[PDB]
Symmetry: D2
Subunit: 257 residues, 4 copies
Amino acid sequence: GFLDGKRILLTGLLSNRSIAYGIAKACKREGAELAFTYVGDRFKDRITEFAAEFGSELVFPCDVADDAQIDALFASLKTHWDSLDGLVHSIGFAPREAIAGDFLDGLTRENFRIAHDISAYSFPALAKAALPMLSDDASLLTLSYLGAERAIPNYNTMGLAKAALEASVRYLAVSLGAKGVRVNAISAGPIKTLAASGIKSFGKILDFVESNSPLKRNVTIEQVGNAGAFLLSDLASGVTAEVMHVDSGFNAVVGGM
Amino acid sequence: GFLDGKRILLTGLLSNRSIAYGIAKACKREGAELAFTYVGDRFKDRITEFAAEFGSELVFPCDVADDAQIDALFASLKTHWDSLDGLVHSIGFAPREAIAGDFLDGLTRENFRIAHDISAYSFPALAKAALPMLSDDASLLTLSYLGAERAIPNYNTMGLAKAALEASVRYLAVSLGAKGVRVNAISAGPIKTLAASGIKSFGKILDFVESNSPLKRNVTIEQVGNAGAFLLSDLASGVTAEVMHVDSGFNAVVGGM
Amino acid sequence: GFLDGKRILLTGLLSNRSIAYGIAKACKREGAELAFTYVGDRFKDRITEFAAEFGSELVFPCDVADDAQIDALFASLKTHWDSLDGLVHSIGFAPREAIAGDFLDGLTRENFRIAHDISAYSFPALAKAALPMLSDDASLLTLSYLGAERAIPNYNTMGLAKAALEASVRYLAVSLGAKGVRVNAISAGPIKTLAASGIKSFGKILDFVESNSPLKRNVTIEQVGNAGAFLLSDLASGVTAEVMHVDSGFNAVVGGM
Amino acid sequence: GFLDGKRILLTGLLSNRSIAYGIAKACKREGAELAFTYVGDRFKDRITEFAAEFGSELVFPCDVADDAQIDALFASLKTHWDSLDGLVHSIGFAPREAIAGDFLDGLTRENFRIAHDISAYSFPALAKAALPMLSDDASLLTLSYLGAERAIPNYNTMGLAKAALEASVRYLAVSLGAKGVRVNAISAGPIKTLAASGIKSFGKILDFVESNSPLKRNVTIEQVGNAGAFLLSDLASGVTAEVMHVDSGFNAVVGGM
Ligand SMILES: NC(=O)c1ccc[n+]([C@@H]2O[C@H](COP(=O)([O-])OP(=O)(O)OC[C@H]3O[C@@H](n4cnc5c(N)ncnc54)[C@H](O)[C@@H]3O)[C@@H](O)[C@H]2O)c1
Ligand SMILES: NC(=O)c1ccc[n+]([C@@H]2O[C@H](COP(=O)([O-])OP(=O)(O)OC[C@H]3O[C@@H](n4cnc5c(N)ncnc54)[C@H](O)[C@@H]3O)[C@@H](O)[C@H]2O)c1
Ligand SMILES: NC(=O)c1ccc[n+]([C@@H]2O[C@H](COP(=O)([O-])OP(=O)(O)OC[C@H]3O[C@@H](n4cnc5c(N)ncnc54)[C@H](O)[C@@H]3O)[C@@H](O)[C@H]2O)c1
Ligand SMILES: NC(=O)c1ccc[n+]([C@@H]2O[C@H](COP(=O)([O-])OP(=O)(O)OC[C@H]3O[C@@H](n4cnc5c(N)ncnc54)[C@H](O)[C@@H]3O)[C@@H](O)[C@H]2O)c1
Ligand SMILES: CCCCCCc1ccc(Oc2ccc([N+](=O)[O-])cc2)c(O)c1
Ligand SMILES: CCCCCCc1ccc(Oc2ccc([N+](=O)[O-])cc2)c(O)c1
Ligand SMILES: CCCCCCc1ccc(Oc2ccc([N+](=O)[O-])cc2)c(O)c1
Ligand SMILES: CCCCCCc1ccc(Oc2ccc([N+](=O)[O-])cc2)c(O)c1
């Protein structure tokens, strides 16, 4: 496959509906060797089962709020892998208050801090901690959403954090690019995952994108996964600092009128 | 003038080269009544002199790192003004390490936190604290830079924070807009201010913009000030959620080839 | 006013609902001297009445399909004015077939040709013909629509032509900018004009923008006019190659979900 | 390969440095069946040799200035293929005057007409003529350049035409998407092809992109080809109305300062 030989670390695989699950499945199909992170002891058994499905026993804890766990992740990983070819950052979090209702009602200094720390800072933080073991043709991928670009109701503080995340893709690309490392994001359309499940208005967004996107259909983790595998691969060696929409074209219309 | 009657609070007026000085001068010319903030006791005399130049004795301390000072600012201001028509956010800060050299070399969780707290969070934080006294046709303005949109060497962590700031303009515009309040940014070209003065490569940026911008000249605080006054005024009542470039057109070219 | 002394030629003033009427009214208020173009003998009396309302008897025919009429326009104008400070291009046309229904159903080589000739080519064509008499601080303004940026149903071939028009703003800005001439567009929200009146779905667009824009209201020719006058003025001397949205913020949201 | 079974028609393969050659080579590798167009009798032998290299004898004349040749192309092709799965539009032209020197010096109504007719109109014109035989999962791809987005010296009238081309990608995506057909562009970085060879400043652009792009290297037709094959494939079934940069990240920086 077009990732033969490539060693790829994936964060964010929480259930079999996770975007990271789709990316894992496509990377394994194309020949990559995988490793996984998880957060919290109670998920160790579950992520171990997913790793095994993808032919791997490489699982490591990493809460990206914690500098020591980010350093320990790569210290552990390096006892197995000489080098790392791919990193998938599929991590987002804001306190519930901050993505419900009115933007200002949910705004506090701490809600802002936490949303930007986990959803944006953690991507270049993982990149920096990985760099000593990154291969020269490595590829780093994160997941963003259209709320970075345009204001979407309720996304609120997460939209600010995703805009900072997309900017980090560009500054990472410059930092890491003379070495040869590529950095990109997929701006994925709405997909019913665990994270999406806490958003009251999510059903309405899904209906709206189905009715108004050019392809008149919502995207799947298989579609996001295949685009992810492409970006992580040498097929995409001309592509860096890009935010690729995988959203049935929804970003490119004015819908619903 | 086209701001007659309007009461406008300006942050960030540090010296007579500050962008906020240019905006102050243009707003006063067009008829507004002004008030000012400062940070740190040693600047009280200086900002009092600037306020007096603009016919005002309304000066208030406000370090935007501190929730209590943000609340105290508007509690003080309201003992003078029933209502507020304009707010100018002209505040930026990152630790020096984070805007020098390589992006990852200057990246730490705390540098990221501080840059986003002061340069991005503080704008919607001031808006929220102001809201109880905002007039229905009020106008809020912040200052951004092209480094939000594209990666510029050394701007680094500030570019992430300005991307979050520009997103806050859009989410603020939606939050405050049913009331009638407008929210915009000016993406200003390079101007030799105190903040610019700590950037070793700033002379080179200024030369590059002079040689390659469409107007073949750098912008002034008078030009940024006039565009600011326009956005704060009822002339701009159709304009919200906008990031207006005031940069001699530099953002719109590929220069230097 | 802030256009005192400025001599401004306005195209596209067809009725008192025209965007060019709003721009005319704001420019006259701010002190400019005006001149006007029209298309077709039967409109000479009407445009003469509008010119007189704005204190001017300067009216000239100009169908922008015709090179000879574009040259004759400036030859005539120069017998009155030594120099020209402002040009407002408020001209759009596509054959009806090309802005109804499905994009491909309305697509033909000739419909494409005509839409791009009148709606896009004519702006830099007028600029070139004006250049010998442009003042060094002159300002050229055109009108665009969000359909240039994103696909909007029915706008179809006009969306292609407006994207070429917005690109012409950038290339004009570079061509004319060393002289000191600025070039900008306003991307106006929907306004019920004669041109809008032939679009069956226009009522629905107006309702949608009223419900979903940040300011929860449609824009007026007074709002577009005031932003136009600003851009044509020395207040905006730092601004060129810009496409300014004057659309109640609608461009910056995802609406209707 | 990931295009097994797919039948793809490629325009624009002029020499073995053509972008269309790279796309052809990658599509054949991934399993597609190919067909080719050419312009002008003297190139029939050459394109026949290229087709044979890709295991095909399917070659057809098509000058996209001529409606009859566009119709005859698909009438011919359909005698071989029941259905068409991919179309590569890799066609650009402007008169030499219009891409040299100053934008206005090279501007005439006819130069504008020709540049937009060949470089922009022809893409949706081919799509429309193909539609009766397009498969429901077909994929249409065109090639654009950063000069659509920002003004680049000398690109001039081609930049307007590429902006109209990128808009056609969005309107095509909506027109064709309910059927299931995807439409995208690659915005390719500079590559030394025959078309590039007539541009005096091209060496300087290539040097500038090598020095300033994030990956500090120019792109190849292999890189553009691999990204093209991806977009033409079912791997990219979530992606439509997208303009993908394949340019070593150059679009995302401000370079050369
Ligand atoms: N699902 C959608 O519609 C959609 C659309 C666009 C983008 N995104 C983004 O895709 C990414 C993946 O989310 P998903 O939808 O697949 O949901 P998910 O719930 O399957 O995955 C979210 C992941 O974030 C991880 N996470 C949260 N806090 C973390 C921390 N402190 N440390 C380490 N990991 C942490 C979770 O453990 C979980 O694995 C997120 O960045 C999300 O913002 C989701
Ligand atoms: N000067 C430029 O080239 C340029 C270009 C674009 C944008 N900007 C932005 O313009 C704004 C104004 O900067 P300037 O160039 O006029 O420089 P300046 O040095 O005159 O003003 C910077 C201001 O930030 C204030 N500030 C910093 N930390 C603060 C805190 N904790 N609390 C309250 N105020 C704080 C300072 O007191 C000072 O007044 C900043 O947002 C900057 O990012 C500057
Ligand atoms: N009304 C809207 O919602 C809206 C929104 C955005 C942009 N625009 C743009 O604003 C501009 C003004 O349109 P308007 O809405 O004020 O409508 P309008 O009908 O008042 O003005 C359209 C003008 O185009 C002129 N025109 C058409 N063909 C011409 C030719 N061959 N030669 C010279 N003039 C020609 C007409 O004479 C008329 O004056 C157009 O470019 C339009 O695309 C309109
Ligand atoms: N080479 C670059 O740096 C570069 C960068 C970006 C984009 N592009 C675009 O890539 C595309 C391919 O160009 P290329 O660089 O591979 O150059 P090329 O010279 O190899 O191909 C240009 C093709 O355009 C075709 N063409 C021109 N007029 C035509 C007509 N009337 N009918 C049918 N075909 C016609 C030519 O026959 C030729 O095959 C063009 O759209 C170009 O604008 C090129
Ligand atoms: C709220 C607006 C609708 C968003 C729809 C698409 C989407 C879905 C899930 C997304 O992922 C998350 C992850 C975490 C959290 N949260 O902890 O607050 C929220 C969202 C998202 O980014 C994006
Ligand atoms: C470093 C790249 C060049 C930037 C040029 C334009 C510019 C100048 C000053 C700018 O303002 C600041 C304010 C504070 C700090 N800092 O404390 O780190 C840095 C910058 C700016 O945003 C933007
Ligand atoms: C069709 C989609 C809705 C568009 C709404 C906003 C708008 C209104 C009027 C607009 O102006 C015109 C001018 C001419 C022609 N026409 O002759 O085909 C069409 C439009 C417009 O650009 C833009
Ligand atoms: C002139 C500015 C530099 C452009 C560099 C990248 C580039 C190279 C080749 C490109 O392709 C063409 C095709 C045809 C013609 N012409 O006939 O005038 C011109 C260009 C291009 O689009 C884009």
